[PDB]
Amino acid sequence: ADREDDPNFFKMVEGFFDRGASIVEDKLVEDLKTRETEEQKRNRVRGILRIIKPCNHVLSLSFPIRRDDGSWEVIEGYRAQHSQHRTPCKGGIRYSTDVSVDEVKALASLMTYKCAVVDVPFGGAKAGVKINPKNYTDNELEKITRRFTMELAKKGFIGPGVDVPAPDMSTGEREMSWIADTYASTIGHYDINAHACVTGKPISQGGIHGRISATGRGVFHGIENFINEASYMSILGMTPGFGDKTFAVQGFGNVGLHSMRYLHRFGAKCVAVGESDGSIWNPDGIDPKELEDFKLQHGTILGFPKAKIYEGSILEVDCDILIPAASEKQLTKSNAPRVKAKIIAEGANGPTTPEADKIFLERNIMVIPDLYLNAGGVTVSYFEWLKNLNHVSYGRLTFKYERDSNYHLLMSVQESLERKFGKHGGTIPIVPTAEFQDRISGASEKDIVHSGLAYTMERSARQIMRTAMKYNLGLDLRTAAYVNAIEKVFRVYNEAGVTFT
Amino acid sequence: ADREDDPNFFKMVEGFFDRGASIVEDKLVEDLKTRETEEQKRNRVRGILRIIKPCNHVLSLSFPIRRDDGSWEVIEGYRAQHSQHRTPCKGGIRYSTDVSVDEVKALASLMTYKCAVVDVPFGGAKAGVKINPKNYTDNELEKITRRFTMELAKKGFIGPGVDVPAPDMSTGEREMSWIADTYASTIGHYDINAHACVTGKPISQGGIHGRISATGRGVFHGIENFINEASYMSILGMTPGFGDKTFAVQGFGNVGLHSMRYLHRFGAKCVAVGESDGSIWNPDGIDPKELEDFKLQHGTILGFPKAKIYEGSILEVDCDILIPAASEKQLTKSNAPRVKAKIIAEGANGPTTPEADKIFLERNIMVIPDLYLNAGGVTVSYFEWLKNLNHVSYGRLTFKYERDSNYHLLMSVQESLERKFGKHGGTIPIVPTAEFQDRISGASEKDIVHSGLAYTMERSARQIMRTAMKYNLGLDLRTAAYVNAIEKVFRVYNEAGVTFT
Amino acid sequence: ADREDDPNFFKMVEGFFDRGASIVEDKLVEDLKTRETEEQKRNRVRGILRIIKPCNHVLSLSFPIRRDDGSWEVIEGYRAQHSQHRTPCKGGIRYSTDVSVDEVKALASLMTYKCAVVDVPFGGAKAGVKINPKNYTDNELEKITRRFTMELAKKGFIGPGVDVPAPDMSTGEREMSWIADTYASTIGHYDINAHACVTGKPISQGGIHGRISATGRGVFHGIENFINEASYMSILGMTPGFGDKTFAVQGFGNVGLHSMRYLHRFGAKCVAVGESDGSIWNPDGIDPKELEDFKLQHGTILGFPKAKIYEGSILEVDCDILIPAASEKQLTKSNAPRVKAKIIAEGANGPTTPEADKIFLERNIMVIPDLYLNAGGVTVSYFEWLKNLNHVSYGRLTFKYERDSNYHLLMSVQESLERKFGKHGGTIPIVPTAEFQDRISGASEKDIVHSGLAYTMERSARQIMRTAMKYNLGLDLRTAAYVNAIEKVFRVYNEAGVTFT
Ligand SMILES: NC(=O)C1=CN([C@@H]2O[C@H](COP(=O)(O)OP(=O)(O)OC[C@H]3O[C@@H](n4cnc5c(N)ncnc54)[C@H](O)[C@@H]3O)[C@@H](O)[C@H]2O)C=CC1
Ligand SMILES: NC(=O)C1=CN([C@@H]2O[C@H](COP(=O)(O)OP(=O)(O)OC[C@H]3O[C@@H](n4cnc5c(N)ncnc54)[C@H](O)[C@@H]3O)[C@@H](O)[C@H]2O)C=CC1
Ligand SMILES: NC(=O)C1=CN([C@@H]2O[C@H](COP(=O)(O)OP(=O)(O)OC[C@H]3O[C@@H](n4cnc5c(N)ncnc54)[C@H](O)[C@@H]3O)[C@@H](O)[C@H]2O)C=CC1
Ligand SMILES: NC(=O)C1=CN([C@@H]2O[C@H](COP(=O)(O)OP(=O)(O)OC[C@H]3O[C@@H](n4cnc5c(N)ncnc54)[C@H](O)[C@@H]3O)[C@@H](O)[C@H]2O)C=CC1
Ligand SMILES: NC(=O)C1=CN([C@@H]2O[C@H](COP(=O)(O)OP(=O)(O)OC[C@H]3O[C@@H](n4cnc5c(N)ncnc54)[C@H](O)[C@@H]3O)[C@@H](O)[C@H]2O)C=CC1
Ligand SMILES: NC(=O)C1=CN([C@@H]2O[C@H](COP(=O)(O)OP(=O)(O)OC[C@H]3O[C@@H](n4cnc5c(N)ncnc54)[C@H](O)[C@@H]3O)[C@@H](O)[C@H]2O)C=CC1
Ligand SMILES: Nc1nc2c(ncn2[C@@H]2O[C@H](COP(=O)(O)OP(=O)(O)OP(=O)(O)O)[C@@H](O)[C@H]2O)c(=O)[nH]1
Ligand SMILES: Nc1nc2c(ncn2[C@@H]2O[C@H](COP(=O)(O)OP(=O)(O)OP(=O)(O)O)[C@@H](O)[C@H]2O)c(=O)[nH]1
Ligand SMILES: Nc1nc2c(ncn2[C@@H]2O[C@H](COP(=O)(O)OP(=O)(O)OP(=O)(O)O)[C@@H](O)[C@H]2O)c(=O)[nH]1
Ligand SMILES: N[C@@H](CCC(=O)O)C(=O)O
Ligand SMILES: N[C@@H](CCC(=O)O)C(=O)O
Ligand SMILES: N[C@@H](CCC(=O)O)C(=O)O
């Protein structure tokens, strides 16, 4: 944590909101066309916004466990539900000591708008267990997450139609596998959609393919849709395309390692990798496989053979693209000036504070907002949820049909050409290309996740790019997204009677 | 609020706990008799205590209402569940702007031990809606409490087997009548015990006789069982009995008005009555029926014809018995020295801070602790709960039997005496006394509440007086009660496996 | 039942398991990637296998039915749930006097692996009512199955998210229609997915097209994918293709009649048909839609005009392909030597005992295992289940789109060719082939069942073939399938924490 700029997390995000609030508030009053045409439209709007910003529910949990050494410990744990204009709430579970109600109240709110950015029909939620996960044995962490699932389940803070958790900092597949099992074996025993209570699940437990990457893949597509618009690259003095760029990732978690993998593939070059014990560096480039294989073996990126051990801030490392994939409030009033880089891809949730945005705005540094960029996490989870509901491995019912159907479709173009060019213009093979033989049978689960994600990272980027053009926000993409979010979330409340009254 | 001594409410009550924790800690290790005789007994005790102290659950609510003037307002609202060693949780709903999570986390904990004092089998809960209730119209207050019931019901913070609210500051019958009706008409629709979700209900709604008084009646019984022990009255330099005492009540609510009524009856004089706008005074005595009739008509005690307004603190009024029936943290390090008086009957929840107890201890001033004294509220509610479970007006099935049975019992003593004293002994009428003609048919609902309350304000004062003798606490009755509470609450956790693990 | 080889049914199938257990045990330890790398990877593999083998749950039912003649009779009835690594359990209901807990414990286990073979996400279950169904009137059989549904429903052994029965020996559509109706009208009254509690339902009740055939269709696909692989036909000394083969089916039920129909169509020629009263024979060929018309009219295949009555065991009939579609344990140590045939297509559940496999292995006789071959039953049921969850007749929402879309797609190939070949080159009709006019609108429910089944009988055969090659099992396809099943079922347990603990 910084101190010069360590603003309250929930209020910080409220700040981002209140800015989007004003910028559409005119439009919201404008298409509202009710009888009560006045500034009653405005106060009907300025009331519904006041209903949105604050969280609907927060549950606080002091629950015991008996540690491995026979002793008793009390665990603090929180789950804020921000909005519910879409049931079920969505949002991850975070294991840290930083965990605090305001931090979960903040992340939850982010999930509300984040889902509104990428048109996932979930209300925002989040949750923290206030533990250093390093300091508990795996059996302790199991007994902790299972118990946390119970106490959440009993008070209505996890359920396929109510609230669907997912992984986050220091939680992943394993934790999610437990959360399902408890709910499936206990309270959700008769629930057919029981295993749809939580995403990020291991594939064998009902998870969806590519969800672990997913968030990092979406990070790729988010940087892409912008870095391949010279209209913005003209404003950063950079060339369109990944081919020649250099980047740096703070954090090497599920968002870091996979944001590094998907860029080091589709073009650019990793220069430096951070972690909560220090960074490594190499301008020549760092291979993600080698580094990952070194973090698996030795549990730290430090001491990488093919990269020095950068003294200094990772956020300041000279590069093109800075990807904070760590915790929040990392770029602040004080270090934001020194960031030497040109594109900020917020992988992590709110890693940049509003005072860093004002600097980055001035310094013509493009911050790709947290709302849009890591929405790949929720999007693929949103798929993992529908998979759990449709109870089929996607593609299965149809494969040998849009296959045979296409081979017959092709055989029509063929017979029709032969049937005009005689036994005596030849035989005309109509045959799938190489990059159609791989789609000849249609959508597999692998593919849907990719294209389903690819589509809405692209679509929702233009939805931002219009709005940044429209209201003339330029490189203030953060305000552009919250404008879109505030509008979509409002549409629900407006056409609803707003409350059971 | 004071500012020399305005300690954190939850931590304040934790303070009272930690004191009781140490004093029995030895005994708890003592009767524990496990295989693992050590100071694992002590750490197995000190762990279970660490599980008790902190609340199990807190739910935080920002829910909208439409005010009367068509506008939207967001309402903040909290319900901490302290313990659950007894389901269902019990505890009131408070309407104030003082409402804060720490204040509800504090009161909830008090309800846990309060129920343990008077052997009510409920875990402690409480709840606040953070509104000034006077600033909302009755229609607003209705759709505020109804909505608050919903959001509590949905997240599992109200239910006959889960959590049973009750009235408190600025809530009473009317609110409770709403809380039932929503739950009964909505979520608890099929629940046979639906109307058992909340106590303090109007009699016509399933309430129990004398519940509104109840808390103030129990306040009478509590002062009584002590003021009629010269062993304590020798230590205060005061005479046993109510007949000659004078008393002052801060606050004129459900706890004030009825603590005043039940003492001005069974003996002593009212000298002064406080309220959040000032106090009235009259050493000659103040009649509760006249005052109440003046507060009903004019909505304030100020300007009472037969009592001027008192210049100065109501708590400092010269008198025998000080009854704070207001909000908490009223007697503090700074005004506790000046308190004229000799018996402090804490009607309100925690109206005295731990530093005031230090002074009162020194100054030989007997503070009758909040745990024991206002437990009449929960006790009669506990009856109101059983009534809604037994679905019978108490006494109904038996009246004309323990009636006819007694008249036949009497007719046996008679015939048997005649059957020995022949003719020439006369006829010997055996006839109920006047007081026994009123009980000839047995327990009515009125009576059970009285004696059922009377019993356990007695049986539990005993249990405190035993323990203040035992561990030699003298006039530290507050520590005496927490000693009983901590022991009873522990007795559950110990014989339980402590957690599903 | 045989005498020399009548092994315990559950232990028999355990035998098939334990064989597959050892063969992958090495691999399972191999890809296990834990840092407890020892031969304690082996013992936690050996533990997880020990958890798989035995059934999780068996429910035993003595329930009364009143017969038609006013009298009372008690009905014995069992439902073992083998595994639950996939909810909901799947598996049929069998009406026989052979029914015994061991026999249901056995079939249930088979359903677990059977679903793992063909990647249906269900745990294995089965159920028997211990009645001779011919000895009860249809109104008796109705009140029997309805009552059996209740007692199963109440104890949690039937439910769309819990356990989904289906037909089996002496049960079919009619019984399944009842099972739905009771649970739809009673316990599942509010359940939206109520009618998804049971498959095999009549089409009008929520059933899926072709489910009655389905199992026999899949029997066709199974024999096919092998008999069209000369790599195995070289090993049996037989020619690839159906065109010239002769087969014999023991049993003429849902599995027999439709295994006969789908082969007598797509090539080969029925030689003999068994039933529980004797067989018929005709080397010239037997038409299924004469023999069925004779069984419908006369309730027996015996005395078929165009086929004499056969003089000995149906299993011993000289032919190419032996299809046991009867009860289990039919080919044993004693008659397995004299089976005069080259391909054994286990339609029935476990019709061949492990000692018969030992002979068939030696005698180079290919047994197509029960796991793989009749998995068409569960597969189409698995479709019937998803249909009742998706609440739409498949294909409906899209028909007139992938139709118009294709006609527009074709119109693009056309206009683009015309756009290049001018008025000079003519008009170039692009027109669907005959085959493709029947798919022009896309997947109907009929088609999905076919291709959806066709695919996975074809995707899962070529998971067996490329495990029989891998671990060199040759014509031991039964061990090859259990190797796949044990692996897929393992994977869930491994990545799960394995139990609530
Ligand atoms: N798992 C998922 O699907 C999603 C995660 N996110 C966000 O990504 C961010 C974190 O990524 P995770 O997925 O939880 O992976 P993670 O929890 O495994 O990442 C943390 C790793 O990076 C290091 N690290 C943590 N904080 C650091 C800091 N301030 N400075 C330097 N190094 C630090 C730590 O040593 C740790 O090893 C969060 O903001 C999270 O909300 C959002 C999209 C999806
Ligand atoms: N206990 C449960 O019911 C859980 C829910 N599911 C549901 O399964 C449905 C269908 O797709 P998936 O089964 O996930 O297969 P999948 O093809 O999507 O991939 C899952 C992995 O497990 C393998 N697998 C296939 N059948 C399996 C079986 N019966 N048991 C264990 N592993 C099997 C697959 O070959 C694959 O390697 C999903 O819609 C999901 O909702 C799957 C996991 C656990
Ligand atoms: N209603 C019940 O059955 C139970 C309530 N209590 C406690 O009694 C106390 C309050 O009385 P209630 O009947 O609950 O509600 P109430 O609102 O009817 O009574 C409170 C009275 O005291 C006045 N007041 C509030 N704060 C004051 C302050 N700082 N200074 C001077 N006057 C103030 C208020 O104007 C009001 O007249 C609280 O501690 C409450 O939690 C405890 C036992 C049972
Ligand atoms: N809507 C409601 O009022 C609900 C209340 N209940 C149960 O009602 C039960 C009966 O208690 P009570 O008989 O009221 O106490 P009670 O002790 O006062 O019964 C005798 C007197 O109460 C009056 N009374 C009795 N039943 C009444 C009724 N249904 N409506 C209006 N006045 C009535 C009569 O004037 C009678 O003289 C309670 O025990 C409660 O469990 C449960 C469901 C709904
Ligand atoms: N309907 C389904 O879903 C599928 C059924 N199976 C299995 O196929 C076998 C046949 O059952 P279904 O076709 O389903 O219904 P079914 O009950 O109508 O078929 C039974 C046929 O076999 C005859 N039969 C009984 N015992 C015999 C014996 N010792 N010798 C010769 N014939 C005998 C019966 O009289 C009748 O001809 C069963 O073992 C079943 O487990 C396997 C998977 C799918
Ligand atoms: N009753 C159930 O089983 C529940 C499941 N669903 C699902 O909704 C869909 C129902 O469509 P289907 O009627 O099965 O397909 P469909 O309309 O193509 O007709 C198929 C069969 O249903 C009957 N049928 C034809 N038209 C009908 C009509 N307008 N209304 C009622 N029956 C008609 C005929 O017997 C025909 O053989 C299915 O997917 C079903 O699984 C929906 C609600 C409850
Ligand atoms: N730890 C780690 N995970 C990987 C690595 N490569 C891929 N993954 C993840 O592992 C899963 C299996 O990946 P693949 O079988 O290669 O399939 P894919 O669709 O090509 O996946 P991607 O190339 O990652 O988009 C994917 O969901 C990836 O997210 C790697 O090198 N290390
Ligand atoms: N608010 C209020 N209620 C009263 C008062 N007096 C009586 N009641 C109610 O009417 C019932 C009959 O009163 P009483 O005849 O005096 O008998 P009681 O129950 O011993 O009186 P209390 O305990 O003082 O209420 C009581 O149980 C009370 O519920 C009063 O002065 N004020
Ligand atoms: N019992 C019986 N059912 C038949 C027979 N022929 C057709 N069917 C029914 O028809 C269904 C499917 O038939 P079709 O719609 O004609 O499909 P198809 O491609 O023309 O050929 P099939 O599926 O073999 O009949 C089967 O599931 C049976 O229910 C028959 O000879 N006997
Ligand atoms: N925790 C991730 C993923 C949320 C989810 O997939 O539900 C996020 O906040 O974006
Ligand atoms: N609010 C009162 C009454 C609670 C109840 O009766 O449940 C108290 O805290 O004692
Ligand atoms: N009874 C059949 C069908 C099971 C099902 O479709 O559920 C079998 O065991 O394969």
Short mmCIF file of C-alpha atoms and ligand atoms in Angstrom, two decimals, chain C residues 180 191-196 201-208 384-394 396 445, ligand 6:
data_model
loop_
_atom_site.label_atom_id
_atom_site.label_comp_id
_atom_site.label_asym_id
_atom_site.label_seq_id
_atom_site.Cartn_x
_atom_site.Cartn_y
_atom_site.Cartn_z
CA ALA C 180 -43.18 -39.22 -14.73
CA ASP C 191 -40.36 -28.79 -10.22
CA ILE C 192 -40.10 -27.14 -13.64
CA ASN C 193 -37.78 -29.97 -14.74
CA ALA C 194 -40.12 -32.54 -13.17
CA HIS C 195 -40.71 -34.53 -16.33
CA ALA C 196 -36.90 -34.83 -16.69
CA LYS C 201 -40.83 -41.61 -21.84
CA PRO C 202 -43.48 -41.72 -24.59
CA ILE C 203 -42.91 -38.95 -27.10
CA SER C 204 -46.13 -37.25 -26.00
CA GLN C 205 -44.90 -37.21 -22.36
CA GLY C 206 -41.57 -35.53 -23.08
CA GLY C 207 -39.74 -38.45 -24.63
CA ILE C 208 -37.23 -38.09 -27.44
CA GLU C 384 -34.15 -37.14 -23.72
CA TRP C 385 -32.95 -35.59 -20.47
CA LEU C 386 -31.45 -32.47 -22.07
CA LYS C 387 -34.64 -32.14 -24.12
CA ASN C 388 -36.71 -31.99 -20.97
CA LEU C 389 -34.29 -29.40 -19.62
CA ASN C 390 -34.22 -27.23 -22.73
CA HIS C 391 -38.08 -27.36 -22.87
CA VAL C 392 -37.98 -27.15 -26.68
CA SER C 393 -38.51 -29.66 -29.41
CA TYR C 394 -35.01 -29.55 -30.89
CA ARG C 396 -37.60 -25.42 -33.70
CA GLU C 445 -34.98 -33.96 -33.28
N1 LIG D 6 -44.46 -32.18 -20.68
C1 LIG D 6 -43.02 -32.28 -20.54
O1 LIG D 6 -42.48 -33.32 -20.69
C2 LIG D 6 -42.18 -31.04 -20.21
C3 LIG D 6 -40.96 -30.78 -21.09
N2 LIG D 6 -41.07 -29.72 -22.06
C4 LIG D 6 -40.44 -29.81 -23.37
O2 LIG D 6 -41.22 -28.90 -24.47
C5 LIG D 6 -41.14 -29.52 -25.62
C6 LIG D 6 -42.52 -30.08 -26.06
O3 LIG D 6 -42.63 -30.20 -27.46
P1 LIG D 6 -43.33 -31.55 -28.14
O4 LIG D 6 -44.83 -31.54 -27.93
O5 LIG D 6 -42.75 -32.77 -27.46
O6 LIG D 6 -42.95 -31.57 -29.76
P2 LIG D 6 -43.93 -31.54 -31.10
O7 LIG D 6 -44.80 -30.31 -31.13
O8 LIG D 6 -43.06 -31.54 -32.34
O9 LIG D 6 -44.88 -32.89 -31.12
C7 LIG D 6 -44.30 -34.14 -30.87
C8 LIG D 6 -45.32 -35.08 -30.16
O10 LIG D 6 -46.00 -34.45 -29.23
C9 LIG D 6 -47.57 -34.46 -29.65
N3 LIG D 6 -47.88 -33.12 -30.11
C10 LIG D 6 -47.76 -32.60 -31.34
N4 LIG D 6 -48.12 -31.31 -31.29
C11 LIG D 6 -48.48 -31.03 -30.03
C12 LIG D 6 -48.94 -29.89 -29.41
N5 LIG D 6 -49.21 -28.56 -29.92
N6 LIG D 6 -49.23 -29.89 -28.12
C13 LIG D 6 -49.07 -31.02 -27.40
N7 LIG D 6 -48.62 -32.14 -28.00
C14 LIG D 6 -48.32 -32.15 -29.31
C15 LIG D 6 -47.72 -35.44 -30.50
O11 LIG D 6 -48.04 -36.68 -29.73
C16 LIG D 6 -46.34 -35.64 -31.17
O12 LIG D 6 -46.10 -36.96 -31.38
C17 LIG D 6 -40.18 -30.69 -25.34
O13 LIG D 6 -38.89 -30.31 -25.49
C18 LIG D 6 -40.44 -31.01 -23.86
O14 LIG D 6 -39.30 -31.82 -23.33
C19 LIG D 6 -41.82 -28.54 -21.70
C20 LIG D 6 -42.71 -28.55 -20.46
C21 LIG D 6 -42.88 -29.82 -19.61
#
